Ligand binder design. Structure first.
Ligand SMILES: O=C[C@H](O)[C@H](O)[C@H](O)COP(=O)(O)O
Ligand SMILES: O=C[C@H](O)[C@H](O)[C@H](O)COP(=O)(O)O
Lengths: 232, 232
């Protein structure tokens, strides 16, 4: 059987909607990630939306898509707890540590994930790697610190690339910050690197979700969906 | 002899200008803090400004004051290194760990301090405490995370108070964020607490300068200026 990457993303989006229906009680609020795979989950969740109160969203794009389906979106400050957060990843390793932030809303994703009891990572097989780092690591930085943080990254052998828009000017996040996409790191200890980068003044968020990684991953392969589980 | 708090701030500002003239070579760029004590330093530095190229500033207010003295202000991205950063503190303990952020520009102060080789804390005697925490600890937070971070702080017995302007609406920082001023913590291990809070998604900066604390403190007492030194 031949499945394209888009078909594998649909498979895991549907599998995640089933995970929610199987594990999350009626009336719950669902934490919703960002990106192409998450969008497949949103479409699948829409089919069962009547059993849930609504969602907490990790991005402007996700909020727009949820709303296009008539799903209620709650600001996180309104919500005392979340059982589940379903999101994609740019990469995931054997420990369930992830690189995220390749697209929008690095910071928001990490915040929603921090509240949710269970992080369900949905990804096609190409996202599972032996060692994180070949996908550039996003670091959200206060602009005044751009060069200071870049030098710290270069000291580690990292190649920091300021994220730019089509028009060549700096991408700016929702909180008025820049992103350095860092290439050339071979991240054998993601929890340790996460703590080190979080300790640098001027860093807002680092796209290593490792101290709080995936609890499970629904992985869409050419032979079907695999369910991978990880320890806290 | 009787000295007011304002007179003690002037004493340490002047002492810091002498520290700079004694230790920092002609042509250097000086890192400049924020607040009332820092403003005394700015006024004293202005008297010797012809021997220095200019300054890197930690706040809008500081930049305005430097400029009022005809001191050139460089954006930090223009500057490869800084020998010294002179700034106040809301509190400083025996290890030279500080609480800062009580006034403006928590994040900027911490960034400039991170680049400077030597942090000179200027403070009157009332700032030296046995244990940090009676001055509320500022935590800069992404607004979506306000309640999530507040709950983590309450778990520690902290009383998180959203910072408000005179008009009662939330103070917003330069990076579009809120500040929680946290009361009731008794911070016996500031480096550990700093790392814990820096590890929470939604935290931008925490006003514990502990992993990188003061290298020395010029402390203005009723018996004169004391010079205190601390280890990295
Ligand atoms: O910043 C975007 C998110 O972290 C996404 O979850 C990640 O980039 C994966 O997106 P996709 O499923 O489109 O590969
Ligand atoms: O956010 C303001 C700074 O951290 C100051 O350095 C601190 O608040 C001390 O200011 P002051 O010298 O006015 O007491």
């Amino acid at each position: 059987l031949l499945m394209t990457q888009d078909e594998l993303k649909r498979l895991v989006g549907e599998a995640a909607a089933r995970y929610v229906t199987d594990n999350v009680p009626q009336g719950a609020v669902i934490g919703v990630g960002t990106g192409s795979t998450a969008n497949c989950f949103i479409d699948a969740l829409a089919a069962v939306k009547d059993r849930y109160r609504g969602a907490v969203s990790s991005s402007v794009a996700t909020t727009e898509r949820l709303k296009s389906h008539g799903i209620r979106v709650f600001d996180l400050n309104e919500i005392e707890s979340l059982q589940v957060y379903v999101d994609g990843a740019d990469e995931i390793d054997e420990s369930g540590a992830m690189i995220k932030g390749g697209g929008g809303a690095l910071t928001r994703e990490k915040i929603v994930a921090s509240v949710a009891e269970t992080f369900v990572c949905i990804a096609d097989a190409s996202k599972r790697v032996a060692m994180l780092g070949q996908f550039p690591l996003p670091v959200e930085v206060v602009p005044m610190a751009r060069t200071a943080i870049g030098r710290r990254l270069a000291a580690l052998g990292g190649v920091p690339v300021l994220r730019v828009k089509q028009d060549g000017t700096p991408y700016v996040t929702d909180n008025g910050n820049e992103i350095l996409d860092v290439k050339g790191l071979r991240i054998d200890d993601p929890r340790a690197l996460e703590a080190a980068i979080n300790g640098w003044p001027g860093v807002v968020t680092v796209g290593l979700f490792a101290q709080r990684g995936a609890d499970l991953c629904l992985l869409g392969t050419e032979h079907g969906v695999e369910t991978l589980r990880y320890a806290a």
